[PDB]
Design a protein around this ligand. Structure first.
Ligand SMILES: *[B]([O])([O])[C]([C]C1=[C][C]=[C]C(C([O])=O)=[C]1)[N]C([C])=O
Length: 263
């Protein structure tokens, strides 16, 4: 609804930065509303969903086991490793690593998984093969959050990410069981409380993934809908702001409040 676009422009004015937004129909894939849909933005931690998607495809293919255990050490630990840092001694299974990377944004968990699949270049090749010729992963955590203006590394476009997420959640790409596992991880997200989740009415469904990075970068991808089932995909990215994390969270939540009001 165009009233949501008014809020999106207002957020750009408040933040002194670019905001990219897209609302996509889950079922048909039609674009319902967009703002800077084809400009590139840094993906930040929202890539974590794509990563586990690639891991699940390997599991479906017999090349990986969710139950497999990975051991790492103090040397692998990077900033923002709340979960991995507590399991140094016993390691963690693939399943727990994906759960940590998705529900808590754990950086070390993502790096470990990136390694198992062959690194950024392979995650990038997996996306390419599913029809996404725009989104690209080039670095590991946390360097991928640099957000250097005009840099293409580690970026996606709102339309690219929305359509890719739709294919992952509803395409023939993953088996039903894996699709569900993916949705289960996103629905259990524990760090995105002050974003879309704060505008969501009771009884709605939400499965999401946030991210933050340098240069005021912040973003969120989500599948949501009334009555406990998703029916739309929303992607929102911003970068360039000098505003505080709280101000960035607020504008994103005000964008969500508008989207919900005009559902
Ligand atoms: B991700 O954005 O690449 C990662 C870890 C992260 C930090 C702070 C907030 C979130 C989130 O999920 O909202 C994620 N970012 C960095 C800078 O390490």
């Amino acid at each position: 609804h165009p009233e949501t676009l008014v809020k999106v422009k207002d957020a750009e004015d408040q933040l002194g930065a670019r905001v990219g937004y897209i609302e996509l129909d889950l079922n048909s894939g039609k674009i319902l509303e967009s703002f800077r849909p084809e400009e590139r933005f840094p993906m930040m931690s929202t890539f974590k969903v794509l990563l586990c998607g690639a891991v699940l495809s390997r599991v479906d293919a017999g090349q990986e086991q969710l139950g497999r255990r990975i051991h790492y050490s103090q040397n692998d630990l990077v900033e923002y490793s709340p979960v991995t840092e507590k399991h140094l001694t016993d390691g963690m299974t693939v399943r727990e690593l994906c759960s940590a990377a998705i529900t808590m944004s754990d950086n070390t968990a993502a790096n470990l998984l990136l390694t198992t699949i062959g690194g950024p270049k392979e995650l990038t090749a997996f996306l390419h093969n599913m029809g996404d010729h725009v989104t690209r992963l080039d670095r590991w955590e946390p360097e991928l959050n640099e957000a250097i203006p005009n840099d293409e590394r580690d970026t996606t476009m709102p339309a690219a990410m929305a359509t890719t997420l739709r294919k992952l959640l509803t395409g023939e790409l993953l088996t039903l069981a894996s699709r569900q596992q993916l949705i289960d991880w996103m629905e259990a997200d524990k760090v995105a409380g002050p974003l879309l989740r704060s505008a969501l009415p009771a009884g709605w469904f939400i499965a999401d993934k946030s991210g933050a990075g340098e240069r005021g970068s912040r973003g969120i991808i989500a599948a949501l809908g009334p009555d406990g089932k998703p029916s739309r995909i929303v992607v929102i990215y911003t970068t360039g702001s000098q505003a505080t994390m709280d101000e960035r969270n607020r504008q994103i939540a005000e964008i969500g409040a508008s989207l919900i009001k005009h559902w």
